[PDB]
Amino acid sequence: SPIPVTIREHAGTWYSTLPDSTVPIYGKTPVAPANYMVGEYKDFLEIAQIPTFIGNKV
Amino acid sequence: SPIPVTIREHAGTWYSTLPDSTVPIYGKTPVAPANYMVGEYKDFLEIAQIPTFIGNKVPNAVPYIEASNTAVKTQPLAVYQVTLSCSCLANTFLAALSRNFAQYRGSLVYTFVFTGTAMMKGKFLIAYTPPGAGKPTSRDQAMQATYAIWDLGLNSSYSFTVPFISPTHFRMVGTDQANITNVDGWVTVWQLTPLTYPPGCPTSAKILTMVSAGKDFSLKMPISPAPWSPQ
Amino acid sequence: SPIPVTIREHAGTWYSTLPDSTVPIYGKTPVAPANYMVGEYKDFLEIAQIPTFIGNKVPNAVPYIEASNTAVKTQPLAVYQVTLSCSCLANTFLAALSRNFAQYRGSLVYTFVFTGTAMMKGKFLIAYTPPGAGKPTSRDQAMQATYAIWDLGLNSSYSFTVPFISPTHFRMVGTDQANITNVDGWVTVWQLTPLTYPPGCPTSAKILTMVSAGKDFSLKMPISPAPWSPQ
Amino acid sequence: SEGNEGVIINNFYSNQYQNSIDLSANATGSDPPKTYGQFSNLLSGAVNAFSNMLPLLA
Amino acid sequence: SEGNEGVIINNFYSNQYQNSIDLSANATGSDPPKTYGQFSNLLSGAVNAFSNMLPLLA
């Protein structure tokens, strides 16, 4: 009844960009409501559209 | 048919607060029925509401303040900082409970029990001053903030609630260093009218002081205070 | 597609009592039919109910007590402590069974078989004294506790049940050290009336003493007693 | 409430094993089951009725 | 009853593998199956009926 596993060669590696989460150590923590907040953006493209200054005579 | 697994980098670690269980080694053990039992509670908030004694005149603490036969607008009977760290609250269940959490929110209740003679009479001005301009220095300045007038008569005590006035949703429980002129303001007690009495009666009385949580009060994130020794 | 796992800190441990199975190495093995078999039991409680012999006069144990032709209210015929550890019970199946568990609950049954002559007559007072005031010192004190009068006649034995009287739901099986004046009380056997007989008959008789569990009796938490050698 | 456990998976060990078993005792006692299993020695011929009977004393 | 096992999961190895196989023998015996498989050598032409027959002795 214990389940048999095959350990992959890459056992133990850490991937800086792994598409996954790790162990939570301090659960059930409610946050401070931040619902009055304004000005949020979600995609850089949302603001890449605002013109900024080109430098002349560098 | 054996299943392939990828071992995570954190293999082998122990987390003191893991949201999970371990290996059971002695199953199917029935317990001794404890169904006759009474008095159980399940949330600390359930008892944080019971008032305990504030220590006056530290380190020669007494559970009360003294009213006199003189009203000096310049002289508070008591000045408490509104901090769950006040040495004043150090031994109240509120403070002992609170020291195991990082933040609090909600109402604090200061209860005063008059213990003088039935023949005495008097009026007190109890005020809560939010921070920003320092502590009030006379009843005249306190009277500019949140306050209540407590009249002595048939009913023995007065329950003063300091309203949670704060920029943040929560406030830190304990102080790191000491909190200045800060903290969250002050509760000051003043005489409005002096204690008056007839002939044959003492000229001062003791007022019992207690503190508790209001129905509003909340605590969050359990931690451990710095270890201490009561002696 | 290989599945990611988090290895727990206890990786590699062996638990002598794990509620689980291991790797099978020789499957599909049919057994030799044993279906003609009889006499099987499945719970120790099934046989703990069969009376076995109490040892009297340790370490020169005999399976009986002796009744005489004299009733001294000051002299018990036997005094057993109600402890599954009494050296008295040391070799009863009850005691041998019980020593593999931590706690017991329920009724203990002391059975007496009269083995004297048919011509003899007599009455015994068998009492159970709960703890608290020490063991009774005369039949007069025993008679103040739980007791039964056993009259000799056609029917040979008497089954005395000591009621489970205890503050806790369960009682510890074995003693750590020795149990004082404690233990759980005492079973004392006294003569009420002396053994009487006609001419031509012996003037004393042997009474066989056994012990068993009552239907009430329960045992819990299997452990191992301190190892011993019968020699 | 509950404690600090927040796993989605069903506990691998069943409860009677993962936890102690809360029992409750009723004030007035409880009757043992009638039988603890089927092991037994049997007494037969205990009584009478039937033999080379009534030649037998009164 | 059962022993000391209290896992929720279905045993990974099936029973015929995890345990011995209790069989029961009946008093009066049991008939082997008729055939143990389909391997066989065959005897043909064993008998008669049909040939350049009845010129054949009586």
XYZ file of C-alpha atoms in Angstrom:
636
model
C 0.000 0.000 0.000
C 2.837 2.631 0.172
C 3.027 3.802 -3.529
C 6.073 2.930 -5.672
C 7.864 5.890 -7.324
C 10.666 6.249 -9.859
C 12.967 9.205 -8.987
C 13.909 11.343 -11.978
C 17.496 12.165 -12.688
C 16.904 15.842 -12.003
C 15.969 15.099 -8.356
C 16.687 18.059 -6.055
C 17.087 20.931 -8.633
C 15.741 24.455 -8.104
C 14.298 26.334 -11.109
C 14.140 30.128 -10.655
C 11.109 30.292 -12.972
C 9.204 27.085 -12.146
C 5.528 27.376 -13.089
C 4.579 26.276 -9.530
C 4.161 27.190 -5.879
C 5.993 26.109 -2.682
C 5.126 25.318 0.935
C 2.883 27.811 2.799
C 3.980 28.236 6.448
C 1.580 30.767 7.920
C -1.932 30.077 6.676
C -5.295 31.632 7.268
C -3.879 35.101 7.502
C -6.442 37.766 6.588
C -5.067 40.927 5.024
C -5.840 44.600 5.621
C -8.622 45.622 3.274
C -7.185 47.682 0.440
C -10.405 48.152 -1.346
C -10.347 52.001 -1.298
C -7.293 51.901 -3.632
C -7.294 53.369 -7.155
C -4.913 53.663 -10.086
C -4.137 49.985 -10.580
C -2.840 48.584 -13.909
C -2.319 45.018 -14.926
C -0.404 44.908 -18.120
C 2.642 47.022 -18.949
C 1.045 47.577 -22.361
C -1.568 49.554 -20.505
C 0.980 52.264 -19.783
C 3.510 51.792 -22.563
C 1.220 53.925 -24.566
C 1.927 57.095 -22.598
C 4.547 59.268 -24.310
C 7.782 60.118 -22.546
C 10.700 62.314 -23.674
C 13.261 61.510 -26.300
C 16.751 62.870 -25.395
C 18.295 65.175 -28.011
C 21.907 66.135 -28.114
C 23.144 63.421 -26.018
C 4.006 1.219 -13.468
C 6.029 2.684 -10.508
C 5.138 6.458 -10.758
C 7.795 9.001 -11.812
C 8.368 11.924 -9.400
C 10.393 15.133 -9.514
C 11.970 15.911 -6.093
C 11.682 19.554 -5.070
C 14.702 21.474 -3.957
C 13.324 21.820 -0.446
C 13.391 18.015 0.046
C 13.770 17.046 3.720
C 12.864 20.388 5.471
C 10.782 20.614 8.654
C 8.310 23.511 9.022
C 7.263 24.227 12.629
C 3.884 25.518 11.406
C 3.097 23.235 8.447
C -0.639 23.134 7.730
C -0.512 19.294 7.862
C -0.391 16.146 9.962
C 2.280 13.431 10.461
C 2.417 9.658 10.911
C 0.036 8.099 13.484
C 1.713 5.231 15.398
C -0.908 3.996 17.835
C -4.296 3.911 16.140
C -7.750 2.898 17.196
C -7.274 4.161 20.699
C -10.575 5.085 22.356
C -10.428 7.874 24.913
C -11.993 8.247 28.355
C -15.368 9.901 27.949
C -15.138 13.519 29.044
C -18.665 14.368 28.262
C -19.607 15.531 31.809
C -17.183 18.487 31.393
C -18.296 22.138 31.446
C -16.733 25.566 31.054
C -15.143 25.098 27.645
C -14.241 28.055 25.371
C -13.028 28.023 21.829
C -11.853 31.432 20.891
C -9.705 33.705 23.048
C -12.061 36.519 22.030
C -14.658 34.702 24.065
C -12.814 35.610 27.248
C -10.880 38.707 26.237
C -14.011 40.532 27.058
C -13.766 39.928 30.799
C -12.217 42.898 32.613
C -9.025 42.481 34.597
C -7.080 45.014 36.698
C -4.998 47.877 35.445
C -1.876 48.470 37.624
C -1.563 51.996 39.042
C 1.571 53.413 40.508
C 3.879 51.025 39.007
C 6.092 49.275 40.239
C 4.077 49.515 43.445
C 0.965 48.655 41.572
C -2.453 48.939 43.063
C -5.683 48.123 41.237
C -7.104 51.626 41.744
C -6.758 55.385 41.491
C -7.701 57.878 44.156
C -10.209 60.721 43.862
C -9.702 63.678 46.143
C -11.620 66.633 47.406
C -9.968 68.949 44.888
C -10.359 69.460 41.239
C -7.089 70.724 39.720
C -7.674 71.055 35.964
C -3.968 70.719 35.681
C -3.709 67.379 37.369
C -4.966 64.158 35.844
C -6.010 61.369 38.231
C -4.537 58.980 35.647
C -3.024 59.030 32.221
C -2.872 55.711 30.334
C -1.250 55.365 26.943
C -3.455 53.547 24.540
C -0.939 50.866 23.672
C -1.375 47.180 24.436
C 2.212 47.654 25.767
C 1.615 50.257 28.452
C 3.359 49.033 31.598
C -0.045 50.008 32.966
C -1.760 47.058 31.206
C 1.163 44.593 31.615
C -0.840 42.187 33.771
C -4.411 42.382 32.372
C -5.621 39.325 30.480
C -6.055 41.688 27.470
C -2.386 42.478 27.479
C -1.286 38.889 28.245
C -3.512 37.622 25.418
C -2.530 40.335 22.989
C 1.204 39.821 23.435
C 0.926 36.535 21.428
C -0.335 38.352 18.271
C 1.091 40.904 15.853
C -1.828 43.246 15.320
C -5.128 44.352 16.894
C -8.161 46.339 15.806
C -11.270 47.575 17.527
C -12.485 48.911 20.865
C -10.713 49.006 24.189
C -12.860 49.211 27.354
C -11.700 50.987 30.487
C -14.083 50.217 33.389
C -14.092 52.328 36.589
C -15.736 51.046 39.792
C -16.350 53.681 42.500
C -15.453 52.221 45.896
C -15.887 55.235 48.145
C -18.764 55.818 50.610
C -22.440 55.983 49.601
C -22.524 59.472 51.107
C -19.862 60.755 48.658
C -20.609 62.642 45.494
C -18.495 63.765 42.505
C -18.019 64.008 38.703
C -15.135 62.838 36.549
C -14.144 63.797 32.986
C -12.624 60.736 31.151
C -11.106 61.568 27.773
C -9.455 59.806 24.853
C -7.031 62.035 22.865
C -5.824 60.743 19.443
C -2.180 61.414 18.674
C -0.762 64.225 16.648
C -0.649 67.152 19.061
C 0.838 65.439 22.106
C -0.912 64.568 25.340
C -3.345 67.094 26.788
C -2.057 68.993 29.731
C -5.198 70.210 31.424
C -8.775 69.011 31.579
C -9.473 71.983 29.343
C -7.463 70.443 26.506
C -8.680 66.940 27.145
C -12.249 68.202 26.919
C -11.477 69.002 23.300
C -11.221 65.345 22.340
C -13.502 62.377 22.944
C -14.743 62.407 26.501
C -17.502 61.420 28.877
C -18.667 62.918 32.241
C -19.174 60.249 34.925
C -21.618 61.306 37.696
C -21.486 59.332 41.025
C -24.922 58.051 42.306
C -26.705 54.790 42.698
C -24.908 52.974 39.944
C -21.324 52.053 40.956
C -19.271 51.821 37.741
C -18.709 53.519 34.394
C -17.569 51.742 31.178
C -15.607 54.142 28.871
C -14.853 52.822 25.336
C -11.921 54.285 23.441
C -12.920 54.363 19.805
C -10.528 52.794 17.283
C -9.275 55.878 15.461
C -6.567 54.978 13.078
C -5.175 55.498 9.594
C -4.502 51.776 9.205
C -7.062 48.980 9.438
C -4.946 47.447 12.156
C -2.413 48.623 14.685
C 0.721 46.829 15.800
C 0.314 45.122 19.240
C 3.752 45.548 20.760
C 6.446 48.165 20.691
C 9.884 47.672 19.201
C 12.138 50.055 21.259
C 9.487 52.357 23.133
C 6.870 54.466 21.245
C 7.718 58.156 22.097
C 4.842 60.701 22.203
C 3.147 58.295 19.888
C 1.562 55.079 20.765
C -1.999 55.715 19.843
C -2.958 58.551 22.069
C -4.012 58.773 25.713
C -6.864 58.032 28.125
C -6.756 60.750 30.868
C -8.997 60.837 33.947
C -9.742 64.240 35.584
C -11.922 65.518 38.424
C -14.663 67.877 37.025
C -16.132 68.550 40.435
C -14.334 67.552 43.627
C -15.412 64.598 45.778
C -17.901 66.164 48.240
C -19.082 64.622 51.514
C -20.872 65.190 54.738
C -19.310 65.323 58.161
C -18.197 61.842 59.422
C -17.018 60.520 56.154
C -13.558 59.998 54.709
C -12.356 62.672 52.221
C -10.963 60.481 49.460
C -12.012 57.290 47.749
C -10.541 54.533 45.662
C -11.713 53.945 42.107
C -10.976 50.335 40.811
C -9.650 50.373 37.212
C -10.038 47.485 34.776
C -9.620 46.936 31.010
C -11.240 44.533 28.472
C -11.812 44.102 24.737
C -14.990 45.651 23.172
C -17.251 43.551 20.866
C -15.346 45.185 18.050
C -11.893 43.922 19.091
C -9.918 41.532 16.915
C -6.320 40.159 17.056
C -4.361 38.498 14.194
C -1.157 36.521 13.472
C 0.042 34.392 16.368
C 3.601 34.788 17.400
C 5.565 34.641 20.644
C 6.554 37.652 22.793
C 10.160 38.089 23.913
C 10.668 35.474 26.651
C 10.703 36.792 30.188
C 10.960 35.659 33.783
C 8.368 36.959 36.273
C 11.187 37.302 38.732
C 4.691 14.933 -16.590
C 6.826 13.275 -13.817
C 4.947 14.416 -10.612
C 6.570 16.914 -8.212
C 6.845 15.792 -4.557
C 7.892 17.464 -1.314
C 9.882 15.049 0.923
C 8.869 15.165 4.578
C 11.445 15.607 7.264
C 10.781 12.137 8.627
C 11.940 10.533 5.339
C 13.309 7.007 5.864
C 11.943 6.194 9.403
C 10.579 2.783 10.414
C 7.567 2.641 12.770
C 7.137 -0.708 14.563
C 3.361 -0.161 14.710
C 2.605 1.595 11.403
C -1.040 1.151 10.402
C 0.111 -0.120 6.961
C 1.482 -2.964 4.871
C 4.813 -3.497 3.034
C 6.022 -5.033 -0.227
C 4.715 -8.527 -1.123
C 7.442 -10.673 -2.755
C 5.797 -14.012 -3.446
C 2.275 -13.465 -4.731
C -0.499 -15.719 -5.869
C 0.343 -18.371 -3.350
C -2.669 -20.529 -2.470
C -2.731 -21.945 1.040
C -3.593 -25.399 2.371
C -7.292 -25.479 3.149
C -7.794 -25.288 6.898
C -11.503 -25.320 6.777
C -11.963 -28.447 8.976
C -10.536 -26.466 11.946
C -12.529 -25.702 15.111
C -12.032 -23.842 18.372
C -11.115 -20.440 16.973
C -11.507 -17.206 19.000
C -11.087 -13.656 17.884
C -11.065 -11.417 20.862
C -9.188 -12.061 24.102
C -12.355 -10.937 25.894
C -13.908 -14.084 24.528
C -11.750 -16.167 26.842
C -10.944 -13.742 29.639
C -14.204 -14.813 31.066
C -13.042 -18.325 31.925
C -11.984 -18.612 35.573
C -8.455 -19.633 36.471
C -6.850 -20.203 39.893
C -5.893 -17.589 42.413
C -2.654 -18.495 44.293
C -2.989 -18.602 48.090
C -0.102 -18.603 50.466
C 2.390 -17.323 48.133
C 5.188 -18.352 47.367
C 3.888 -21.760 48.411
C 0.792 -21.212 46.400
C -2.198 -23.449 46.613
C -5.408 -22.964 44.639
C -7.558 -22.746 47.781
C -8.267 -21.255 51.185
C -9.257 -23.171 54.277
C -12.426 -22.738 56.334
C -12.250 -23.749 59.961
C -14.570 -24.528 62.793
C -14.138 -21.056 64.275
C -15.394 -17.699 63.339
C -12.955 -14.999 64.505
C -14.369 -11.654 63.332
C -10.845 -10.447 63.564
C -9.379 -12.938 61.172
C -10.037 -12.908 57.451
C -9.800 -16.234 55.594
C -8.320 -14.208 52.719
C -7.614 -10.653 51.772
C -6.993 -9.924 48.074
C -6.073 -6.492 46.798
C -8.174 -5.501 43.874
C -5.280 -4.826 41.541
C -4.570 -6.784 38.375
C -1.036 -6.824 39.917
C -1.725 -8.626 43.176
C 0.889 -11.363 43.510
C -2.293 -13.271 44.313
C -3.502 -13.074 40.674
C -0.017 -13.376 39.076
C -0.831 -16.646 37.318
C -4.538 -16.333 36.365
C -5.270 -15.905 32.668
C -6.919 -12.567 33.652
C -3.665 -11.286 35.014
C -1.531 -12.778 32.203
C -3.883 -11.238 29.624
C -4.168 -7.915 31.386
C -0.421 -7.417 31.726
C -0.238 -6.690 27.939
C -2.554 -3.623 28.226
C -2.377 -0.234 29.922
C -5.851 0.143 31.363
C -8.926 -1.882 32.378
C -12.531 -1.143 33.272
C -15.429 -3.207 34.492
C -16.235 -6.169 36.726
C -13.902 -8.652 38.335
C -15.327 -12.071 39.309
C -14.050 -14.035 42.281
C -15.496 -17.584 42.226
C -15.395 -19.838 45.326
C -15.949 -23.609 45.042
C -16.657 -25.426 48.335
C -14.728 -28.704 48.398
C -15.460 -29.937 51.902
C -17.817 -32.811 52.839
C -21.534 -32.891 51.984
C -22.215 -33.203 55.710
C -20.546 -29.826 56.449
C -22.398 -26.584 56.886
C -21.315 -22.923 57.185
C -21.715 -19.263 56.099
C -19.135 -16.849 54.741
C -19.187 -13.037 54.485
C -17.333 -11.886 51.278
C -16.816 -8.132 51.065
C -15.402 -5.557 48.672
C -14.111 -2.374 50.402
C -13.341 0.675 48.177
C -10.240 2.617 49.141
C -10.057 5.729 51.216
C -10.217 4.476 54.795
C -7.738 1.606 54.600
C -8.492 -2.096 54.684
C -11.147 -3.321 57.102
C -9.821 -5.038 60.138
C -12.751 -7.091 61.327
C -15.779 -8.620 59.668
C -17.676 -5.871 61.446
C -15.964 -3.201 59.348
C -16.063 -5.211 56.168
C -19.805 -5.631 56.620
C -20.034 -1.879 56.162
C -19.035 -2.066 52.510
C -20.285 -4.181 49.622
C -20.728 -7.753 50.736
C -22.581 -10.999 50.226
C -23.376 -13.920 52.625
C -22.602 -17.325 51.078
C -24.610 -20.208 52.636
C -23.282 -23.801 52.073
C -25.922 -26.338 50.774
C -26.670 -28.209 47.627
C -25.069 -25.761 45.270
C -21.240 -25.943 45.420
C -19.908 -22.513 44.386
C -20.513 -18.792 44.811
C -19.639 -16.098 42.207
C -18.892 -12.704 43.897
C -18.566 -9.690 41.527
C -16.576 -6.685 42.680
C -18.290 -3.645 41.247
C -16.144 -1.161 39.304
C -16.146 1.803 41.673
C -13.850 4.458 40.448
C -13.393 8.176 39.890
C -11.865 7.569 36.461
C -13.500 5.766 33.546
C -10.543 3.427 33.505
C -7.940 2.216 35.945
C -4.285 1.542 35.256
C -3.512 -2.224 34.883
C -0.068 -2.494 36.426
C 1.774 -0.855 39.260
C 4.836 1.322 38.859
C 6.764 0.833 42.182
C 4.050 -0.910 44.513
C 0.641 0.711 45.297
C 0.652 1.320 49.130
C -2.703 1.192 50.997
C -4.151 2.067 47.656
C -4.624 -0.174 44.762
C -8.338 -0.154 44.390
C -9.524 -1.570 47.631
C -9.823 -5.108 48.985
C -11.820 -8.338 48.695
C -11.862 -9.956 52.204
C -13.361 -13.360 53.022
C -14.615 -14.006 56.603
C -16.418 -16.807 58.433
C -19.909 -15.588 59.604
C -20.765 -18.893 61.212
C -18.150 -21.586 61.780
C -17.949 -24.759 59.680
C -20.198 -27.217 61.581
C -20.231 -31.000 61.164
C -21.401 -34.260 62.554
C -19.256 -36.880 64.199
C -17.036 -38.785 61.670
C -16.255 -35.892 59.469
C -13.154 -33.757 59.063
C -13.234 -30.331 60.806
C -11.917 -28.106 58.033
C -12.426 -27.839 54.308
C -10.749 -26.379 51.278
C -12.435 -23.669 49.236
C -11.064 -23.399 45.588
C -10.567 -19.744 44.536
C -10.681 -18.537 40.936
C -10.922 -15.170 39.129
C -12.345 -14.071 35.722
C -13.543 -10.978 33.862
C -17.268 -9.982 34.154
C -19.327 -9.183 30.999
C -18.540 -5.580 31.792
C -14.739 -5.933 31.617
C -12.701 -4.136 28.977
C -8.921 -3.664 28.397
C -7.230 -1.023 26.170
C -3.842 -0.068 24.653
C -1.557 -3.013 23.975
C 1.908 -2.815 25.331
C 4.469 -5.245 26.724
C 5.059 -5.982 30.435
C 8.576 -5.838 31.869
C 10.304 -8.987 30.568
C 10.723 -11.778 33.074
C 12.004 -15.318 33.398
C 9.735 -17.913 35.049
C 12.811 -19.236 36.751
C -13.016 25.438 14.982
C -10.109 23.581 13.402
C -6.487 23.974 13.784
C -3.710 24.446 11.428
C -4.224 21.970 8.712
C -5.273 22.937 5.153
C -4.671 20.012 2.853
C -7.193 19.257 0.063
C -6.503 15.593 -0.006
C -8.411 13.235 2.037
C -6.349 12.070 4.957
C -4.422 9.044 3.870
C -4.767 7.287 7.251
C -8.342 6.979 8.386
C -9.527 8.727 11.392
C -9.683 6.032 13.849
C -5.991 5.869 13.174
C -5.104 9.497 12.701
C -7.017 10.529 15.831
C -8.015 9.246 19.268
C -11.647 8.037 19.410
C -13.912 10.336 21.413
C -16.468 8.129 23.192
C -19.212 9.194 25.417
C -20.446 7.459 28.511
C -24.003 7.519 29.572
C -24.747 8.139 33.193
C -26.872 5.050 33.654
C -24.415 2.549 32.157
C -24.441 0.443 29.071
C -25.004 -3.258 28.550
C -22.135 -5.288 27.179
C -22.981 -6.955 23.948
C -24.380 -10.420 24.682
C -21.386 -12.140 23.101
C -17.775 -11.158 22.395
C -17.413 -13.624 19.493
C -18.404 -17.251 18.824
C -15.900 -19.123 20.881
C -17.577 -21.351 23.457
C -17.525 -24.649 25.432
C -20.964 -26.139 25.702
C -22.822 -27.855 28.333
C -25.180 -30.456 27.051
C -27.558 -32.872 28.738
C -27.916 -30.330 31.573
C -31.597 -31.125 32.235
C -33.890 -34.111 31.377
C -37.131 -35.220 29.700
C -36.658 -38.580 27.902
C -34.968 -41.904 28.931
C -36.000 -45.341 30.266
C -38.170 -43.168 32.401
C -40.498 -43.117 35.049
C -39.180 -46.445 36.469
C -36.991 -43.696 38.167
C -37.800 -42.522 41.879
C -40.296 -39.877 43.013
C -11.809 -8.221 13.050
C -8.910 -6.535 11.277
C -5.519 -5.729 12.404
C -3.511 -2.655 12.456
C -3.910 -1.102 9.109
C -5.886 2.128 8.508
C -5.030 3.482 5.096
C -7.787 5.063 2.947
C -6.193 4.188 -0.309
C -6.954 1.062 -2.048
C -4.102 -1.360 -1.686
C -1.718 -0.761 -4.517
C -0.887 -4.471 -4.947
C -3.942 -6.613 -5.433
C -4.895 -9.137 -2.940
C -3.830 -12.245 -4.532
C -0.446 -10.632 -4.288
C -0.656 -8.828 -0.990
C -2.083 -11.894 0.768
C -1.978 -15.693 0.679
C -5.056 -17.230 -1.003
C -7.380 -18.981 1.439
C -8.845 -22.005 -0.372
C -11.251 -24.476 0.941
C -11.322 -28.171 0.273
C -14.472 -30.127 0.099
C -14.587 -33.433 1.863
C -15.688 -35.411 -1.162
C -13.027 -34.127 -3.570
C -13.139 -31.985 -6.630
C -12.810 -32.817 -10.302
C -9.858 -31.384 -12.163
C -10.887 -29.208 -15.017
C -11.149 -31.345 -18.159
C -8.204 -29.589 -19.791
C -5.202 -27.618 -18.526
C -4.816 -25.643 -21.780
C -4.940 -26.440 -25.513
C -1.665 -28.173 -26.038
C -2.132 -31.677 -27.423
C -0.813 -34.473 -29.706
C -3.610 -36.158 -31.567
C -4.370 -39.604 -32.495
C -6.179 -39.917 -35.751
C -7.441 -42.871 -37.755
C -7.856 -44.759 -34.455
C -10.982 -46.653 -35.578
C -12.541 -47.450 -39.020
C -15.654 -47.194 -41.210
C -14.701 -46.467 -44.859
C -12.027 -47.948 -47.228
C -11.826 -50.515 -50.062
C -13.998 -52.398 -47.669
C -15.659 -55.447 -47.057
C -13.254 -57.390 -49.352
C -11.557 -57.458 -45.837
C -11.860 -60.694 -43.545
C -14.670 -61.615 -41.144
